[PDB]
Structure formats: C-alpha cells, structure tokens
C-alpha cells in the first residue's frame with residue numbers, strides 16, 4: 001500500500017482510495033494529517049533560526065518555551081526537561097543517566113533495569129534490550145547485560161486457571177518482588193513501563209497492578225520510568241497515561257507525538273531526586289558528557305509548542321476521552337462475535353484479539369494468520385489498522401468524531417462477518 | 426524572573442553543559458540567523474565559524490529549505506511506509522557515494538545511525554554463522570555519538586566517565602595525532618607505520634576471527650580536528666583487508682564538501698564498506714541521518730521522516746546547483762593558508778586542517794607542548810576573547826576549531842582569521858601582565 005497524502009483522519013493511496021488511519025500512523029499523528037498551523041509554525045521558525053544547538057551553555061527561544069511548557073504540564077512535580085530526536089534515543093539516554101546517577105550517589109552496583117515482556121521501548125542496542133518483544137533480540141545478541149524482564153500483565157494470556165484479575169495483579173507484583181530480592185535489591189536502579197503496552201498488543205494492565213507494583217518499588221526506593229511514548233498527550237482519556245493509571249514516575253518519557261509526528265522530536269522529564277545528583281556529578285567532571293546534535297531542535301520545538309497549543313485550544317484531551325468512551329463501548333458490542341477472543345482498551349486505544357476457538361483461545365495456524373487475514377479485508381473496507389499477531393489495534397487521531405468512530409467500528413464488524421463466512425471453508 | 430535565561434535555568438537540562446555552572450551563569454540565547462552569522466537575543470552578531478555543530482552547510486538563512494519543508498508537511502507530514510522524498514533521497518545518496526553502494530538506511534541522528542550499524546553487523550555475523558565476529562575497533566579521541574553503543578565507540582573520556590562505558594565488544598586503538606603521539610625522532614610516515622602495526626597487534630591479540638569492523642572518521646572532528654599522518658589510511662586499509670575486517674567511514678562531519686571533496690573518503694582514498702552521514706546532509710535544518718552499505722555487507726542479509734527527507738533533498742540540490750563543494754574547496758585553500766601564517770605565533774603549538782576544517786592548538790611552552798593549568802584553560806580563555814571579537818569557535822581542550830559554512834567567501838575568511846590573530850595577541854599580552 002503506497003500512501004501519498006493525508007487529510008484529517010484519512011490517508012490516500014496513489015490510486016485515490018481513502019482510508020481511515022486507525023493507528024494515526026505510528027500511534028503518533030494526534031492532530032491528524034492536515035493541520036495547517038503546524039506547517040505555519042515550522043516555516044516561520046525555519047526562516048528565523050533554522051538551527052542552533054543546546055550544547056555548552058547555548059539555547060534558543062523555542063526549546064526554552066517547550067521545556068517550561070512540558071515541566072508545567074507534568075502529571076507529578078518535575079524539575080527539568082531534556083530533549084532528543086526519538087523515543088528510542090530518549091530511553092537510551094535515560095538508561096545512561098540512571099547509571100550516571102547511581103555512580104553520582106556512591107552506588108556502583110545499582111545499575112540493573114527491570115522491563116517487561118511485550119513492552120516496547122525503542123530500537124537502539126540499549127532500548128531494544130529494554131523492549132520485551134522476541135523479534136527485537138536473539139539475532140542481535142540482545143538484551144545487553146543489566147536489563148531484566150519481568151512478566152507481561154496480560155490477564156487474558158497470562159492468568160492461571162481460576163485466577164481472578166486482582167489476584168493476577170497481586171501475583172505479578174509478587175513475582176516482581178521475587179525478582180528484586182533474588183537479584184539483590186540494592187542492585188536494581190529502575191523499573192520501566194508503559195502505562196498501557198502499545199506495540200505489544202494494547203495490553204491494559206489488570207486493575208490494582210500499578211498500585212501494587214508501585215508499593216514494591218517504593219519499598220526498595222527503585223526509580224519508576226513511565227514510558228509515555230504512545231500513551232502521552234490524550235491517548236488514554238487523560239493528558240498522560242500516568243494520570244489514567246495513577247502512576248508517580250520519577251522520569252517521564254515522551255516521543256514525537258509531542259509534535260504529532262510532524263517533525264522528529266522527543267523529550268523526557270526528570271524530578272528533583274534525579275536531577276540534583278546528576279548536576280553535581282556534571283560539575284565534578286566539568287560537563288555532562290552526552291547529547292545529540294539536534295537536541296532541542298528549534299524548528300521541531302516550535303512545531304511541538306504549536307501542537308500542544310492546538311491540543312489545549314481545541315480541547316482534544318476531552319474529545320479523545322469522549323470519542324474513546326464511545327469507541328470502547330462499540331468495540332465491546334462485538335464481544336459475542338464468533339471470532340472475537342478479547343476486546344481491551346482505555347480512552348482512545350483498543351485492541352481486538354481474534355480467535356477461532358474461544359475456550360482454547362486459539363486461532364489459525366500459525367498465530368498471526370487470522371489477524372493478517374482480517375486486516376487485509378479491513379483495509380479493503382477503508383480502514384488501516386495494525387495487526388499485532390492476531391490482535392487488531394485501533395488508535396485513531398484525537399480529532400476523530402463519533403460519526404467517524406461509528407464508520408470505523410462498522411467496517412470492523414463487516415470485516416469479521418466476511419472472515420467468518422470465508423473460514424467455512 | 427521570566428526572562429529567557431532564567432526560564433532556561435529553571436526548566437531545561439542541557440547537553441554537554443556543567444549543570445551547576447549553568448544555574449549560576451545561564452545560557453547565551455541565540456535569536457536568529459543570517460548567512461554565516463547568528464545574532465543573540467541582545468542583538469550582538471557573530472560569525473558562526475563552527476557552522477553550529479559543524480553542520481549548517483548552507484548557512485542560517487536559506488528560505489528554499491523552509492519552502493521544501495512546508496510543502497511536504499502540507500502534503501503528507503508523516504508516514505512509516507515507503508516515488509516520494511524518502512525513496513528519492515535513498516536513490517540520490519547511493520548515486521553520490523564515493524564507492525559503489527547498494528542500500529541506504531535512515532535514522533534521526535548520527536548516534537542512531539552508528540548504533541544501528543553496530544546492530545546490523547552483529548545480526549550479519551550471526552546470519553553468516555560467525556557468532557564470535559562481533560568486536561568493533563574504534564580509536565582514542567574518535568567521536569561517533571552518544572547512545573550507549575555509539576558513546577562506547579566514541580573515544581573521549583568525557584563520554585565514558587561515570588557512564589560505565591564502553592560496553593563489551595568495543596575496542597580502541599591509538600589516536601593518529603602526530604603532534605601529540607609521535608615519539609622523539611619519529612617521522613610522520615613512521616608514525617603511520619607504527620599505528621598500523623599497533624592495529625595489527627590488537628587484531629592478532631584479540632583473535633582476528635573475532636573482529637567484525639573498524640570505524641573511523643576520515644578527519645576526527647570533535648576529538649580536535651585530527652588530520653591523520655600521510656600514508657595512515659593506506660596502511661590501515663592494508664591491515665583490515667588482510668583479516669577481512671569491514672571498514673566503516675563515519676562521514677557525519679566530513680560529508681558533503683567539508684574536506685575539499687564531496688566526501689572525506691575521497692580526500693583520504695578510503696574504500697569503506699559502510700558510510701555514515703548526517704549534519705550537512707540537511708544542513709541541520711531538520712534532524713536526519715543515513716548510512717549506506719555496499720553489496721558485500723548487504724548480500725548475506727538481503728521509514729525515514731518524509732519532511733526531513735524533503736529538506737535533505739533540497740539541501741543537496743542547493744549544494745549542487747550553487748557549486749558549494751568547489752566554493753568550500755577554494756575558500757578552504759585560502760583559510761588553511763591564512764591560518765598557517767600564525768604558526769610562528771608564540772601561543773600556537775600546531776595548525777592542522779584540510780579543506781574547510783581546521784584546528785589551532787594553543788600552548789604557552791612550545792617545546793614542552795604545555796599550556797596553562799589545567800589543559801583546556803588556555804583554549805577556554807582564547808575562545809571567550811574570540812567571541813568578544815564576534816567569532817564563535819569551539820574550544821576542544823586547548824584547540825580552537827574552525828569549520829565555517831560552505832557558503833563563506835574569502836573576505837569573511839579573512840575577517841575570521843584576523844579576529845583569531847588579534848585574539849592570540851590579546852591573550853599573549855594578558856598572560857605576560
């Protein structure tokens with residue numbers, strides 16, 4: 001499929017066929033594909049100061065405004081913002097600064113990072129190691145040393161026979177505590193988690209998961225990294241997924257949804273607990289020895305500022321919340337369809353996991369074929385979704401309206417009826 | 426209180442900055458650009474003799490790039506799928522390569538590019554059934570970026586201290602800086618021979634079957650504009666070829682006209698298997714980087730950003746149309762000559778450079794090759810005075826670097842070097858009083 005242009009929630013292929021972009025590109029195009037104010041902000045800044053760097057006591061207006069804006073928006077008190085080009089780079093720099101911080105606190109052994117199976121955190125050698133998906137690892141010799149993985153909080157696929165949802169949450173927290181104790185709690189620097197796992201199949205954690213996990217982390221004074229790369233800026237029904245799930249991160253990572261993917265930019269926020277010992281170490285060394293050439297890029301920063309202004313001016317967090325409520329309801333009305341194993345989601349993100357045998361939770365051979373078959377029909381019916389194995393993901397732009405949600409979910413129902421009628425046989 | 430400087434102090438953690446000092450002093454805030462000049466928020470204008478971060482090749486006020494960006498952003502601001510600017514740019518870069526290349530890959534940064542190259546090499550050795558051929562040899566004072574892997578490739582102590590780097594599998598051989606590394610009575614070519622011998626000794630000691638690749642900048646930028654001795658690259662390549670080790674040319678700084686040719690690989694007769702680009706690829710007007718691989722690399726293993734790609738394509742077209750490689754070559758010849766007229770200054774230990782990149786290393790005792798206590802104080806002192814005289818350089822320790830935009834003219838080169846000469850006289854006078 002060759003995509004040539006976009007407009008609102010739609011993209012068009014070279015033949016002129018229009019599709020609802022049900023994943024907003026890479027779960028990132030928040031304001032849709034034709035927001036003219038973002039091009040206006042880019043063109044204005046690029047003709048004033050197209051590039052300057054933030055190295056060595058230099059700065060510029062756009063990054064200063066954006067740093068203030070992001071800190072002011074934080075769901076918990078934050079101290080500083082640091083800028084990169086991608087979410088992958090951000091998580092990579094976060095791991096590096098966590099090691100630096102532990103050295104700056106006289107803890108040379110507190111260097112291990114706990115991630116989760118099916119988590120997604122980027123593609124650098126380090127951030128691909130954090131990533132808990134199989135295709136990211138073995139043939140790349142990953143994960144690197146110091147990165148650990150605990151279990152995926154996906155009740156439908158990980159719960160034991162007869163186990164309740166909250167018992168499953170308790171078991172995950174206990175398995176996390178068991179991991180920390182067996183590794184040596186003083187060796188664990190941080191735990192990283194998406195509020196909801198996006199690329200791993202839209203895994204919504206069981207209720208009480210984040211409360212119980214945070215109790216464990218607080219017991220050992222382990223840092224919490226909230227990876228808001230997908231869940232940020234209105235996706236889950238609040239500005240940040242951390243608010244939706246009552247998470248209190250020390251570090252909060254944001255991706256190019258900062259700019260609705262219109263330009264490469266990413267950032268993370270750190271609280272005073274993280275910043276202060278890093279600042280003192282940088283003073284003993286004489287510099288903080290890291291940074292990307294385009295960190296804080298003024299044109300990307302200008303576009304991000306305008307993108308955030310649009311989200312606030314047009315109340316897009318509330319719009320996503322309310323369209324999300326309607327989408328979640330419409331999708332769950334398909335629960336009784338013969339091919340629907342599970343419907344999961346919160347706010348404006350959802351997954352529909354397909355099966356052909358509901359009791360055994362199995363689909364076609366191999367797993368992935370059913371999702372690939374349904375996704376092809378869905379595309380033909382004018383909706384672009386992402387098949388994550390046998391899960392179809394829905395993550396449309398924040399500007400969508402109820403009429404468009406209705407069209408998207410009706411296309412999915414018709415798709416499932418088509419696939420059902422064709423499987424026999 | 427709500428000034429730009431105060432808000433930066435309050436909210437913004439800077440790269441490559443002492444955070445405690447930033448809180449006390451605040452940043453210098455840049456407002457706008459114009460050709461080779463930038464202007465700070467107080468209205469003072471400076472020659473950007475570093476092109477920002479050795480990157481703004483077409484200067485700071487090229488409105489054609491803004492129109493290219495806006496045009497794509499108004500058509501398709503983002504997609505992951507890929508005619509079109511990403512396809513067009515990949516084709517253009519392969520066609521421009523100084524040696525035959527097969528495929529182009531895109532990232533946002535040079536750091537991500539080098540990180541991905543390392544990952545691809547490990548994947549490739551596994552596909553070849555060589556699980557041990559995973560080590561990468563880099564060089565002391567080389568600079569290759571700041572991801573955990575590419576900061577490990579980097580050979581500068583500030584990039585490693587307290588970061589627990591380099592990771593395993595990354596080795597560093599010697600820096601090819603004759604002025605700082607040559608032994609008593611060793612000639613430049615003998616030093617090159619010794620460096621190739623030390624490289625071969627490292628390869629043998631590690632087990633040649635465990636070495637996957639060697640990475641080098643043609644000229645080391647961030648490490649202090651280190652020009653390798655004559656015959657270095659020929660002798661190094663002979664060693665690498667003997668053990669079937671891949672050559673990665675990191676052209677992030679040298680690419681697109683900086684060294685007097687399109688690529689530093691041409692200037693130094695390097696025949697890389699992998700070539701890494703960034704910076705002047707787009708003149709930094711938007712973040713984008715790329716690496717090329719040849720068929721040898723691609724055979725066993727057989728989503729750039731469309732707005733950034735469109736800007737890079739138009740940037741390359743400008744460089745082509747306005748003959749900026751030739752302009753930089755001819756302005757470079759003049760700059761190299763003017764800078765070397767200062768070699769006899771009492772504060773100048775060495776002038777080095779090729780094309781439009783140069784470094785001037787400062788000392789107070791020319792025979793001992795020592796400066797002030799500590800090393801770096803003399804460079805910081807002179808760089809501050811040069812900025813007072815309206816020229817932005819970069820102090821790499823006690824080396825002042827010059828890497829001006831490809832659009833500079835001879836009159837501007839003359840102004841820049843005259844500011845350095847007067848700076849060195851001022852600093853010398855201050856030291857003796």
Ligand SMILES: Cc1ncc(COP(=O)(O)O)c(CN)c1O
Pocket residue numbers: 291292293294533534535536537539568569570571642646647675676677678703
């Ligand atoms: C030679 C070289 N390689 C790689 C990099 C890393 O590029 P980036 O800052 O875009 O990550 C740099 C940037 N200073 C460089 O000079």
